[PDB]
Design an enzyme around this catalytic site. Structure first.
Site, mmCIF file in Angstrom:
data_model
loop_
_atom_site.group_PDB
_atom_site.id
_atom_site.type_symbol
_atom_site.label_atom_id
_atom_site.label_comp_id
_atom_site.label_asym_id
_atom_site.label_seq_id
_atom_site.Cartn_x
_atom_site.Cartn_y
_atom_site.Cartn_z
ATOM 1 N N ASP A 1 1.049 -1.257 0.014
ATOM 2 C CA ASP A 1 0.080 0.141 -0.070
ATOM 3 C C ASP A 1 0.843 1.213 -0.041
ATOM 4 O O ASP A 1 1.765 1.591 0.843
ATOM 5 C CB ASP A 1 -1.391 0.034 1.253
ATOM 6 C CG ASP A 1 -2.184 1.227 0.733
ATOM 7 O OD1 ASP A 1 -2.161 2.325 1.370
ATOM 8 O OD2 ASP A 1 -2.895 1.082 -0.433
ATOM 9 N N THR B 1 -5.299 7.380 -2.256
ATOM 10 C CA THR B 1 -4.186 7.944 -1.403
ATOM 11 C C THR B 1 -2.673 7.464 -2.000
ATOM 12 O O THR B 1 -1.755 8.360 -1.892
ATOM 13 C CB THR B 1 -4.053 7.595 -0.135
ATOM 14 O OG1 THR B 1 -4.413 6.246 0.162
ATOM 15 C CG2 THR B 1 -5.175 8.330 0.547
ATOM 16 N N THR B 2 -2.767 6.454 -2.293
ATOM 17 C CA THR B 2 -1.519 5.669 -3.163
ATOM 18 C C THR B 2 -1.562 6.251 -4.415
ATOM 19 O O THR B 2 -0.446 6.600 -5.086
ATOM 20 C CB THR B 2 -1.690 4.180 -3.378
ATOM 21 O OG1 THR B 2 -0.632 3.589 -4.072
ATOM 22 C CG2 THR B 2 -3.029 3.423 -3.843
ATOM 23 N N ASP C 1 -12.269 -6.342 2.167
ATOM 24 C CA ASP C 1 -12.303 -5.975 0.809
ATOM 25 C C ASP C 1 -13.882 -5.694 0.651
ATOM 26 O O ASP C 1 -14.248 -4.682 0.051
ATOM 27 C CB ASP C 1 -11.865 -6.854 -0.398
ATOM 28 C CG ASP C 1 -11.340 -5.859 -1.555
ATOM 29 O OD1 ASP C 1 -11.665 -6.330 -2.863
ATOM 30 O OD2 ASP C 1 -10.875 -4.833 -1.224
#
Lengths: 509, 64, 521
Positions: C45, C78-79, C382
């Protein structure tokens, strides 16, 4: 900072340099590693944990090697040499060629498919072992002990382990998995006859439970578990007021004798004569149990108390109130004091809570004690693995060659681009066969060739190469065996290590 | 506000006054002449830098 | 300094971006962040790894801060935002070596960002509670195991995904909405993993107290106790000294007899069921069972809180005032509809069915091995995260890397019409949208250049939809470059995660490009 191609090559070297000597150590035939100190001294070792910890490694990928051998050591304690060899050879054979094309994540997916391929092969190859027949489990232990290279004190240790592990087996979790060996302990006694080694029930304590008064023999009376709060309170059940005055002192003391008095009364009802308090026990408090006519054992560590609780097999209670025969001490505790020497040794026997045992070992000295204790440590690991999964796998490189052709067959059948990583995991297995060839001193070419030939005729059920005879040999015949579970776990950890390391493509500080 | 109450008249921003002074100051200098002519002409060209530097930051080829 | 310091800044941001480029999703590559020179942490991540990592370039420090700002709003994007940001720089940089002002390209990056949101607005699927987001089946399926719960993968995806999208559930006491404070799903082994079902009520993991205990009560008041009942030593009820042995015993034997009387008063206040987060002793458990109260022990914290808030009114998970077995002070009136103890998963467990304040529904999963259950811990994470974004903003966007590539030609179509100096600036914005299909190729171990080409090859007009996939853009996969439909295995994103990312990355692109010093003056 390292980036890209630097990292892939780095991984393979770091793995590799650890490996060379450590692979050789596997098997009865053991090469001995020299470590040279700056002080000009020497430490000689065969144990993988020792080599790794001592050396100075500069590279973060190397550190990951070390830590995975901690992983292995914690689960078993055998095969610790093995995991880095296995993990290294996945990377050598697969990586550099497939990177140039560029597919890392593929090599990783392939590893775990292959891993499953190997777990399935093992059930077929293996036959059941009777998990209550001593004779059949014994030969297995006999294989593992001689890796360390002690073969005299070993003979005793095997047998004592068999009853110790079996009696601390009782773990339920709805599937009846056994990893329980945490109730087991070794009580060490310097001195006495070298041949008195036995098992006695419960859990036996000496690491801080050597005291001059403990009631010499208890053959009926109970142990009273406490994490109380037997110590005085200057208010009701918490301190609300301080002693700093003549007036404060006087008033407070009345409250302090009362609190103690009602505690002892709840302790005595269920008839003890030996009473253990972890902490929350004072100089005035202990004096109160003597006056209650109760022998008090006190100021002994929290670890000892976890141990003593397991020995009666009865739950602990921090509850200061109304401690019953029903809540604490459940079943019978018993307390024997022997002077072996002129030092007080405490046996606590009897566990209700189905069984429990621990080991008496008597040296004639410290040195004599140690030799048995380590080899017993190897021993109860085997006993356990046999209990865990009730199949015994043939030793050496026979198991490795079976899987070596299953992957040749699978990888052809699928004809993916996973095919070539399958082929690199097939050849990564073969290191263990190469190590056993080296051990006799015969050429790698000649014996590997023959082994491969045995796959074609007899499928390598048990026909591997053994390093103490330098020939193809039926492993069953020799009395070379190891448990399934030890093989599976060693293999398991090695794929995790191969997968994690391959994911590092960049190292950035 | 204080700047405008001191000096009642109002001029434009945007850097246009700065070119407009310069051009007049070049022509006048030549009519006047003198050894100091060169000084007042080069001074006016000194002016030409600031609206040019501004235009580059606004994004458009500055000399043009 | 000057141009040169700026170029070092472009290059610095590139190095940072390559790291998160090759670490995106659960399918990224783990990195080594050497935190000292002896200490390391390894995980994946992209956003998380920048925070752990020592950032030292100015271009690097702002991009770590950017990733953090984006997280507050929405933990997705965000990544990604970082990677878009950097790409702007790199593309802009060759135009600065040419003749084109940084200022001229950066204004057309603002304009381009305005067009791109305009596209997002006209491209939306807002029915997504019957084929989900990131498909139905596909949502749960990706972070499952591919060979331990990868053959159970269809059956279990239907169970959990459907349940996240639309089931009755509590929120925060009398407020009925979809669960964005999650669904109470536990994983426990037992039986078939093809026999899994939904039970109306809460799922509890607990150890029974059955030895006299009633195992059915219709209508019940629920004491959810964050406090361990116990009983404990308390000073005398008469006198303040002892001086006789007969008073010592009487006072102690009074301790059992007073407790039985207190239990009946607790019923009359509001109890039929006690749920205690700690354990209950045998000595203390007997008082409750004889009196006619269901007292269960070792109830998991996660369950106990979530029953408490659905049971509403006044409850003792919002407070904790209680010692021992004392009478109830009316702060424990949690409400419930009916309580059935049912044998499920080869263990008897209590099902508190519904509550009167805010009805609930739970899934008790069944594995066969503990190993299966562990894996569904990841499946479930998930499904919950994917669906959570659907529930807040029903407007969602079909395509992930398909939008970006559709958008690349849309911006350029806009660029042709605009003409002038601005046509090239817009074009370069458009090239940086294309990093998105590259980054996923990376994680998949696919060709990058091949992968974007073929997505732009399927085209009629710019617009993304599941109507066509072999003549229009739509979806990707995290393991292939093939286009997919939304009843199949394409990717979706929410509206919010996409608009906030593009924008944030533009404000960043301006700041790094600006500087022409770092030098000691």
């Amino acid at each position: 900072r390292e980036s890209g191609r630097k990292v892939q090559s780095g991984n393979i070297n770091a793995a590799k340099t650890i490996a060379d000597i450590i692979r050789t150590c596997l098997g009865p035939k053991s090469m001995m590693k020299m470590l040279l100190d700056p002080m000009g001294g020497i430490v000689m070792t065969n144990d993988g944990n020792a080599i790794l910890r001592e050396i100075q490694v500069q590279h973060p990928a190397a550190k990951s090697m070390i830590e995975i051998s901690r992983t292995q050591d914690e689960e078993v304690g055998d095969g610790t040499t093995s995991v880095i060899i296995l993990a290294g050879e996945m990377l050598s054979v697969a990586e550099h060629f497939l990177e140039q094309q560029m597919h890392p994540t593929v090599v990783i997916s392939a590893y775990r498919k292959a891993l499953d391929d190997m777990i399935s092969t093992l059930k077929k190859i293996s036959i059941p072992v009777d998990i209550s027949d001593s004779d059949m489990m014994l030969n297995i232990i006999n294989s593992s002990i001689t890796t360390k290279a002690i073969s005299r004190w070993s003979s005793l240790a095997c047998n004592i382990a068999l009853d110790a592990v079996k009696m601390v087996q009782f773990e339920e979790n709805g599937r009846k998995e056994i990893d329980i060996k945490k109730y087991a302990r070794v009580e060490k006694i310097p001195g006495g006859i070298i041949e008195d080694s036995c098992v006695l029930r419960g859990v036996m304590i000496n690491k801080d439970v050597t005291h001059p008064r403990m009631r010499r023999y208890i053959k009926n009376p109970r142990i009273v578990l406490l994490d109380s709060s037997l110590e005085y309170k200057k208010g009701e059940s918490q301190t609300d007021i301080e002693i700093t005055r003549e007036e404060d002192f006087t008033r407070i003391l009345q409250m302090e004798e009362e609190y103690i008095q009602q505690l002892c009364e709840d302790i005595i009802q269920l008839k003890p004569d030996v009473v253990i308090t972890e902490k929350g026990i004072s100089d005035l408090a202990q004096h109160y149990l003597m006056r209650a006519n109760i022998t008090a054992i006190r100021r002994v560590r929290k670890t000892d108390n976890n141990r003593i609780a397991r020995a009666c097999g009865a739950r602990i209670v921090s509850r200061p109130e109304e401690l019953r025969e029903d809540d604490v001490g459940t079943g019978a505790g018993l307390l024997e004091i022997k002077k072996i020497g002129d030092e007080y040794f405490t046996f606590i026997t009897d566990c209700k809570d189905p069984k429990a045992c621990t080991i008496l070992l008597r040296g004639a000295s410290k040195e004599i004690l140690s030799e048995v204790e380590r080899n017993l440590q190897d021993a109860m690991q085997v006993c356990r693995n046999v209990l865990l999964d009730p199949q015994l796998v043939p030793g050496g490189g026979a198991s490795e060659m079976a899987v070596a052709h299953a992957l040749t067959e699978k990888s052809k059948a699928m004809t993916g681009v996973e095919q070539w990583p399958y082929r690199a995991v097939a050849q990564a297995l073969e290191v263990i066969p190469r190590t056993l060839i080296q051990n006799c001193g015969a050429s790698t070419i000649r014996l590997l060739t023959s082994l491969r030939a045995k796959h074609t005729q007899e499928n390598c059920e048990t026909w591997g190469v053994n390093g103490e005879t330098g020939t193809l040999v039926d492993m069953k015949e020799l009395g070379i065996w190891e448990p399934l579970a030890v093989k599976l776990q060693t293999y398991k950890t090695a794929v995790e290590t191969a997968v994690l390391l391959l994911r590092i493509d960049d190292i950035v500080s | 506000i204080r700047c405008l109450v001191k000096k009642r008249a109002l001029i434009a921003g945007g850097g246009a006054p700065e070119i407009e002074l310069a051009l007049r100051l070049t022509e006048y200098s030549r009519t006047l002449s003198g050894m100091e002519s060169y000084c007042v002409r080069a001074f006016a060209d000194a002016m030409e830098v600031i609206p040019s530097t501004l235009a580059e930051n606004a994004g458009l080829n500055p000399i043009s | 300094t000057g141009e040169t310091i700026r170029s070092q800044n472009v290059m610095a941001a590139a190095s940072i971006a390559n790291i998160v480029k090759s670490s995106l999703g659960p399918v990224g590559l783990d990195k080594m962040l050497v935190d000292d020179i002896g200490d390391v942490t390894i995980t994946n991540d992209g956003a998380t790894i920048l925070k752990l990592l020592e950032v030292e370039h100015p271009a690097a420090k702002v991009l770590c801060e950017l990733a953090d700002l984006q997280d507050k709003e929405v933990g997705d994007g965000t990544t990604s935002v970082v990677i878009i940001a950097a790409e702007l720089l790199k593309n802009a940089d060759e135009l600065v070596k040419q003749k084109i002002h940084p200022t001229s390209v950066i204004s057309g990056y603002r304009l381009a960002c305005k067009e791109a949101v305009r596209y997002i607005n006209e491209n939306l699927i807002v029915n997504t509670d019957e084929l989900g987001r990131d498909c139905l089946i596909n949502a749960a399926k990706t972070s499952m195991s591919s060979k331990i719960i990868g053959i159970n993968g269809d059956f279990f995806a239907n169970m959990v995904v459907d349940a996240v999208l639309a089931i009755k559930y509590t929120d925060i006491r009398g407020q009925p909405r979809y669960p964005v404070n999650s669904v109470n799903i536990l994983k426990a082994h037992g039986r078939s993993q093809m026999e899994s079902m939904l039970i109306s009520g809460y799922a509890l993991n607990c150890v029974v107290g059955s030895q006299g205990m009633p195992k059915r009560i219709v209508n019940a008041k629920i004491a959810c106790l964050d406090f361990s009942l116990q009983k404990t030593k308390m000073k005398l009820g008469v006198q303040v000294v002892i001086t006789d042995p007969e008073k010592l015993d009487q006072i102690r034997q009074r301790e059992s007899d007073i407790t039985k009387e207190r239990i009946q008063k607790i019923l009359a206040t509001g109890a039929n069921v006690i749920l205690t987060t700690g354990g209950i002793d045998d000595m203390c458990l007997k008082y409750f069972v004889e009196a006619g109260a269901m007292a269960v022990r070792r109830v998991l914290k996660r369950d106990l809180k979530r029953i408490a808030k659905a049971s509403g009114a006044t409850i003792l998970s919002t407070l904790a005032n209680l010692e021992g077995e004392e009478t109830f002070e009316a702060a424990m009136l949690g409400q419930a509809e009916e309580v059935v103890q049912e044998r499920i998963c080869d263990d008897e467990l209590i099902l508190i069915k519904n509550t009167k304040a805010r009805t609930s529904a739970s899934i008790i999963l069944r594995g066969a091995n503990d190993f299966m259950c562990d894996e569904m811990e990841r499946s479930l994470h998930d499904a919950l995260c994917v669906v959570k974004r659907v529930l807040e903003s029903k407007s969602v966007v079909p395509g992930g890397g398909a939008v970006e590539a559709a958008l690349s030609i849309y911006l350029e179509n806009y660029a042709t019409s605009m003409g002038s100096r601005e046509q090239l600036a817009i074009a370069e914005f458009a090239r940086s949208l294309l990093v998105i299909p590259n980054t996923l190729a990376v994680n998949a171990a696919q060709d990058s250049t091949d992968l974007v080409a073929k997505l732009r090859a399927f085209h009629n007009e710019a617009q993304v939809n599941p109507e066509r996939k072999n003549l229009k853009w739509i979806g990707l996969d995290l393991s292939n470059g093939k286009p997919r439909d939304n009843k199949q295995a394409g990717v979706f994103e929410p509206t919010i995660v996409k608009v906030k990312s593009l924008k944030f990355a533009t404000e960043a692109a301006i700041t790094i490009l600006r500087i022409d010093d770092l030098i000691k003056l």
